[PDB]
């Protein structure tokens, strides 16, 4: 058929990869500040862990647009 | 290594410090009333009881708890940058230990300041068979104290003469290490501290007639080899020659007690100017230098109250 | 509104003052102002007043120390009515029992901690030393090593010459033992050579070092068997002391805080040869309660109420907010920011109408609104119980009063979330597949969807213009308030800013409408030119230059209202996607797969709800906190907060 | 012929990815400071969480254009 | 028709993504200094929140350009 | 049309996006220094604002070229 | 023609590479904070290892799109 | 052929955007140092403004080449 | 066959290069931290080396996809 | 010649933009170090300005190339 | 001769280039910490040098993929 | 004429711009260290000026390649 | 040799360009650390050069693959 | 003529520009450390200068590949 089936996969892969890049950039510093707090005191564990998981929204929104394009294809 | 993480912790701590009103009231009190204020403020967490040694131990323990963890909270290049601010207690531990060992006094004769190193190091440095073994047990991967020591050991492999050499080597190395990294707030302050240090060194050597190149030290910004020489000889117009530089307020000084106060107020002002660096090292620098100014002012006010001195003997020392 | 303030001005004989402050505190609604800037002298405590202050201060401190020691909180109670000497002798016994028992508890468990780490290791080295605990020339102190350090220590320890064995030993499993000497004068040197290779003495402090090795076993055994009984006795006695002492001790603490506060407040007066005076501020609504408390004094001691200034010294007038009961719970959403300056507008009447509406428009789903109502009912249980809520994971603590405000806000917010959920036809998104209650023209269910939302290509322009209209309304209301305040306080620069930006923005907005491609020009060109001429004239009048760049910030704050469409469209579309996936599982895996499809649809809906509900709640309130409140300068100057001289209750 | 369905899929996949990168870059430093304040005193938790969530608008403005472009497929 | 639909969708995505990236870059440092100022004292909440949301105009001009492109079909 | 109309949109997207990125990069550090000066003293609010707004020249030069391109469209 | 097989292979490569870059950027700072905490105290190993492996979920989401997209080849 | 006119728009949109990014990167540090020097003393205002505005020449050159290209329409 | 072969080849070359760049960025910090910890104390060499090697898994996942694409070539 | 006419325009726009970015990158740090030397001593001004102007040769070479490439109209 | 042989050459050149860039990024920080430890004592040299050489696996793998593509050409 | 004359111009502008960017990156740090040394005294002027001018050769290699391409054009 | 004669020249210039960038980024830190070590004492001049010259291997693999491509063509 | 000639020009410009960028990146830090050493002691002039020239092999190799492609053109 037409070339669109191919070129949709570029948009689909480009979306999830940049969202993964963005949340990785976030999680770097968040988890580095986290580990230093646990090394001070185990009482910080829960509040460090939820801060590390909060930036995952970014890659969920990447997977969202990837699966929308996969269903279009 | 992250100054966004560290400066958030430092901003919290910088919120809880003694106001100028605390000192302005405490100047008038009895020692029992001074101890009332001390017992209720943040210092009270280490107040064991009543008496001058108790007050000193409380101030030492709270400052050690509230400042001496900063190099441990960070790691990497931020640890290198912050560690340069706390080194004096480790120099004073080393040269106290070195004198005690050279004169043959027992380890129980030395009292150790809380510093950047753990107390087992100082015991093992006393026990150590030789100055090289001592330097090796002192060493940690970038700390300038141990590398200044291993530098002067080349020049003399034995005790006592090192006392003339260690501090001169160390203060140059601390200023060099700061120029060696991209932090403008630290660099220009430690340059000003080396200017101040050689400036008061020539002043206290005055009248001895020694060779100036033995006591001048490298890495200043506002004072130099020839001004240092003149100021060490019988000349004071060299203070009045200082203009534009922060040291220009030393114009008309002819006394070491006046000089000590002048330099102390200039360096506190220059350090307080570093708050303009909210995501760099100037913020932790200003915090450390305000906290130590608080501790010395609090210690001198406790002496005024305890021994019952005239207020007119203290009002000049506590003003800036 | 900021409530109107009136100055209570009062004078009287210096002997009545201490009692008048008690009367005035006991109906406390006045904010005291220090009457220092006067020709008279500041009031000052006699050594007797100073001594009373000192004694009540010591009672307050000793009571709080005893309460916190017994694990009680120093919350207020009914004040202890008897005298100061009665309060002192009520406090002194219970503090003395409390300190004695906690110190006994601590010192006992500290001895147990040191003992438990050593019972078998000490008993074992004592059995190695069993016949030789008092050797004439081999009574060296105990010694120990790691299982790898034992041979290294033994390599030097072989120099201790003896007929039984050398200082070389290992002797125990939990840690090596070397508690022996062959000839102690050389054996201490062999132990120091072992120390140079790495070794330490086994004479641990406590019962392990305070007695010889013949009695260290007895001491450790006797404390280890005994400590649980006397611990349980101290612990149950500490429990008894708390349930006897609590009520009287916090009743004393309240009395001491009240009395200390009156003695501290007493210095704020002016005083002369024989008379005293005070100044304070009273909000006019409260004035009858001051009037009756002062009118009690037989003389009718000299006072008057004087009207407050607002043109000068407005920065010294105390500020408090008067709100209708429907508005007042929303005060909580503005009170975090600065207190407003006296005579300024308070925006607390604006938030109750816009914020719940915009939140409802943002979420717009019947299923999520029901979940919000359920959690509101769950919080409503805590206020029904009159019970404070805690979550230590967040250091969260809040009283039933705060819970009441939050439940009220949520209940007013879920009504708007239901009605927009009807207008968009959403229930976990796309449950119109399960029954055709809602319908499009393509699937004509029982009621039409008024705005289908999910059809971006059809709907988006309508909701964008709706959102832009909302933004234009709030920003133009805010600039009108800037003009009005500048006019009413006779600060013409704020007038020319307010009218200037508002004229500039109708110029820009007319230009945008013209260049959007509308069907006519007519009056639009005239309105555009009038708007820009008004902007230029207001710039000229003020001689002020910051308006030139700042106009684009104002345009940004008009246009940033698109978020009320954007976060809502994204949330609804994702909820629609997950509900469609739910049906796809239950279809592909058939009737057996319905439980799987339902479970995975439900857990993903609750995941994205939990992960994003905070963001959905935060976006509408930004638009008030910065796009609205900046316009009339809410952050530009700080008011003095009203806090009255009042009972600790 | 043509390939424009393929090419608008590249447009929408790029827009969400760059918006995810931009919020991730912001959230990194904001939460590194926030974990530092929470570690020094847990009372800061609400302040830290408010500031960490404010940058999430950036993804939603990327998703808006991604859903508008999907409506044209 | 042709590829023009493709290309304008790529252009609008590029615009909104880059504008979202710049706002995220700005907001990182501004809100890090903000959280620090609030952590020292709560009287700076107006100043921190104003400065943090000032650079959010850049992504809004990107959205405006994207909407103009979408309407210019 | 086709390639003629399509390439104007990517032309204007680059023009707005890169200018927004540059001004955002400038505003990050300038407003961080601003917040530091404001938290140290409240008398510098006017100067922190005039410095924070001077890099806005960049995004309006980007919007100027984008609108010129829209007119030539 | 047949270019679609080629473009979907670019989609696979771009997705997994960017997700691998994102988790690598994260794991840099996490591992550096971890190694400092273990050199300080050997008991920290479990918390350091948990934080180091948690952002590896990002390359799993990359691989998920690449294996889904290979099923289209 | 209309591709000519289309591709000139990419040329000028790339030129102005890069030159704007260049002066924004230049202005960041100079404006931070400016704000610091103004907070430290108010006598520095002329020197801070002239150093802050001097790197605007780069976007003036960016606009010069963009309008020279627009002359060739 | 045809052009798709060459387009598969850039797809797989891109898959491994980006994953290699990702693991290198990961190892950059972890190796300096490890070298510092080794210079402080020789005993930590086991944990220091384990933390340096864990990010190689990103290149294993890159190579996995490159070999999957080679199996389609 | 229509492809020739369009495609040389992006070549000259690319040159000016990158040369502007390069001199901007230089001028950032040079101006920062200059402003610090003025705040220390107002006598430094000529030296600081000479060093800040020195990196302008880059964008002048960019404009020279753009002009000789515009000579190909 | 078809385009695909040249497009295989792009694929292998891109792969080597990105692997070389990643291992260079790692080796920068690892060599810096190494030279600092050598300046403190000579005994750490052996362990420092194997840490510097460890990241070469990246280029080994990047060049392996280039040779399997060259074999397919 | 046509395509290849058009496409030579992209290679020429790209080369000059990248060379100008590299010498710009080099001159930034070198001249900032130079100005820092000149703030100490006027003796360092020769050595600081010589160090700042050494990286200028890089843009001359860019101009050489550009002129070679122009002569080929 | 057809259009692939063009793409192999892109493959070469890309392969060498990125490998040369990888060596420069590697040498940036190691050369500063080496010059600091010499400034401390001249004893470690051999270790400074050996650590500086080890990352020269990366640009050699860049030339190796470019010359292999030139032999294939 | 032919389109492949234009791709040779893109190839050579890309090779030389990226090599100049890498050598400029290295020379930045190496020259800043050099100026710091001369400012401390004129004794360091000789060693600082030789270290500053060692990263020029990168641009030499870039010029070599560009000249080979030009000769093959």
UniProtKB/Swiss-Prot annotation, chain B:
This is V-type ATP synthase subunit C. Keywords: ATP synthesis, Hydrogen ion transport, Ion transport, Transport. Produces ATP from ADP in the presence of a proton gradient across the membrane. One of its GO terms (cellular component) is proton-transporting V-type ATPase, V0 domain. GO terms for biological process: proton motive force-driven plasma membrane ATP synthesis. InterPro entries: ATPase_csu/dsu_sf, ATPase_V0-cplx_csu, ATPase_V0-cplx_csu/dsu, V-ATPase_V0D/AC39_subunit, V-type_ATPase_csu/dsu, V-type_ATPase_csu/dsu_dom_3. The keyword Ion transport applies. Belongs to the V-ATPase V0D/AC39 subunit family. GO terms for molecular function: ATP binding; proton-transporting ATP synthase activity, rotational mechanism; proton-transporting ATPase activity, rotational mechanism. Pfam families: vATP-synt_AC39.
């Amino acid at each position: 058929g037409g070339l669109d089936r191919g070129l949709i996969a570029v948009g689909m892969g480009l979306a999830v990869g940049l969202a993964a890049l963005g949340t990785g950039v976030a999680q770097a510093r968040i988890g580095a500040a986290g580990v230093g707090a646990i090394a001070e005191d185990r009482s910080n564990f829960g509040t460090a862990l939820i801060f590390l998981l909060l930036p995952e929204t970014l890659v969920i929104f990447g997977l969202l647009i990837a699966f929308i394009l996969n269903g279009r294809l | 290594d992250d100054f966004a993480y560290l400066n958030a912790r430092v901003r919290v701590r910088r919120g809880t410090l003694l106001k100028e009103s605390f000192f302005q009231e405490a100047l008038d009190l009895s020692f029992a009333d001074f101890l009332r204020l001390l017992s209720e403020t943040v210092y009270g967490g280490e107040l064991a009881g009543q008496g001058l040694p108790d007050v000193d131990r409380a101030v030492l323990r709270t400052q050690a708890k509230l400042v001496g963890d900063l190099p441990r909270l960070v790691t990497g290049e931020a640890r290198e940058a912050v560690r340069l601010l706390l080194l004096r207690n480790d120099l004073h531990n080393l040269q106290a230990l070195l004198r005690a060992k050279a004169t043959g006094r027992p380890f129980e004769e030395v009292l150790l300041l809380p510093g950047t190193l753990r107390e087992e190091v100082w015991r093992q440095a006393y026990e150590a068979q030789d100055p090289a073994g001592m330097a090796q047990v002192l060493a940690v991967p970038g700390h300038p104290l141990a590398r200044a020591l291993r530098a002067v050991l080349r020049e003399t492999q034995d005790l006592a003469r090192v006392e003339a050499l260690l501090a001169k080597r160390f203060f140059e190395d601390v200023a060099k290490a700061a120029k060696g990294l991209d932090q403008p707030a630290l660099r220009d302050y430690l340059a000003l501290e080396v200017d101040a240090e050689n400036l008061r060194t020539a002043f206290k050597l005055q009248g001895s007639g020694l060779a100036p190149d033995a006591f001048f030290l490298k890495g200043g910004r506002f004072v130099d080899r020839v001004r240092f020489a003149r100021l060490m000889e019988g000349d004071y117009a060299v203070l009045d020659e200082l203009s534009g530089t922060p040291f220009s307020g030393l114009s008309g000084v002819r006394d070491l007690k006046a000089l000590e106060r002048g330099l102390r107020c200039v360096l506190l002002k220059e350090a307080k100017k570093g708050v303009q660096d909210p995501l760099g090292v100037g913020l932790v620098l200003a915090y450390v230098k305000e906290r130590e100014w608080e501790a010395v002012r609090l210690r001198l006010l406790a002496r005024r109250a305890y021994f019952g001195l005239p207020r007119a003997q203290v009002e000049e020392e506590v003003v800036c | 509104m900021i409530a109107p303030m009136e100055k209570l001005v009062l004078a009287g004989p210096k002997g009545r003052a201490k009692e008048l402050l008690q009367s005035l505190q006991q109906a406390g609604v006045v904010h005291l102002e220090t009457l220092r800037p006067e020709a008279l002298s500041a009031y000052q405590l006699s050594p007797e007043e100073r001594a009373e202050l000192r004694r009540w201060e010591a009672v307050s401190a000793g009571a709080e120390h005893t309460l916190s020691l017994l694990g009680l909180e120093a919350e207020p109670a009914r004040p202890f009515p008897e005298g100061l000497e009665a309060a002192e002798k009520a406090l002194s016994p219970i503090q003395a029992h409390a300190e004695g028992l906690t110190r006994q508890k601590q010192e006992l468990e500290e001895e147990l901690a040191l003992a438990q780490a050593y019972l078998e290791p000490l008993e074992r080295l004592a059995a190695l030393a069993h016949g030789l605990d008092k050797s004439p020339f081999l009574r060296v102190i105990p010694f120990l090593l790691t299982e790898k350090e034992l041979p290294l220590v033994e390599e030097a320890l072989r120099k201790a010459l003896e007929d039984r064995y050398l200082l070389a030993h290992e002797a125990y499993a939990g840690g090596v033992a070397a508690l022996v000497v062959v000839h102690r004068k050389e054996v201490d040197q062999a132990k120091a050579a072992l120390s140079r290779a790495g070794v330490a003495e086994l004479r641990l402090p406590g019962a392990l070092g305070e007695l010889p090795l013949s009695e260290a076993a007895r001491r450790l055994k006797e404390r280890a068997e005994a400590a649980p009984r006397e611990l349980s006795e101290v612990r149950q006695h500490l429990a008894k002391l708390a349930r006897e002492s609590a009520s009287t001790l916090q009743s004393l603490w309240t009395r001491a805080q009240d009395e200390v506060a009156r003695l501290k407040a007493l210095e704020e007066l002016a005083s002369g040869r024989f008379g005293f005076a005070l100044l304070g501020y009273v909000p006019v609504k409260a004035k009858p309660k001051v009037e009756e408390a002062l009118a009690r004094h037989k003389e009718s001691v000299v006072y008057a109420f004087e009207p407050v200034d607002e043109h000068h010294e407005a920065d010294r007038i105390p500020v408090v907010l008067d709100n209708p009961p429907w508005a007042k719970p929303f005060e909580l959403l503005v009170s975090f920011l600065n207190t407003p300056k006296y005579g300024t507008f308070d925006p607390t009447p604006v938030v109750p109408v816009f914020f719940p509406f915009w939140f409802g428009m943002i979420v717009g789903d019947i299923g999520y609104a029901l979940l919000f109502y359920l959690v509101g009912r769950w919080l409503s249980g805590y206020v029904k119980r009159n019970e404070p809520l805690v979550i230590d994971l967040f250091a969260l603590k809040l009283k039933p009063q705060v819970i009441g405000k939050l439940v009220h806000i949520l209940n007013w917010m879920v009504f708007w979330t239901v009605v927009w959920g009807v207008i968009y036809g959403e229930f976990f998104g796309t449950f119109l597949e399960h029954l055709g209650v809602f319908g499009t023209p393509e699937h004509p269910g029982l009621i039409p969807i008024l705005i289908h939302r999910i059809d971006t290509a059809k709907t988006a322009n309508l909701l964008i213009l709706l959102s832009v209209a909302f933004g234009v309304v709030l920003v133009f209301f805010g600039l009108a308030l800037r003009a009005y305040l500048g006019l009413k306080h006779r600060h013409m620069a704020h007038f020319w800013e307010g009218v200037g930006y508002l004229g500039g923005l109708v110029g820009v907005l007319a230009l945008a409408a013209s260049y959007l491609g509308n069907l006519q020009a007519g009056w639009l060109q005239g309105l555009m030119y009038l708007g820009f001429g008004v902007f230029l004239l207001a710039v000229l009048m003020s001689r002020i230059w910051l308006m030139i760049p700042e106009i684009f910030t104002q345009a940004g704050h008009i246009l940033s209202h698109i978020r009320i469409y954007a976060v809502g469209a994204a949330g609804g579309i994702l909820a629609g996607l997950l509900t469609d996936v739910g049906f796809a599982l239950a279809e592909r895996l058939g009737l057996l797969g319905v439980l799987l499809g339902l479970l995975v649809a439900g857990v993903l809906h609750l995941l994205i709800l939990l992960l994003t509900t905070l963001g959905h709640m935060l976006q509408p309130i930004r638009l008030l906190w910065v796009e609205f409140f900046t316009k009339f300068g809410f952050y530009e100057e700080n008011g003095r907060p009203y806090r009255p001289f009042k009972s600790v209750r």
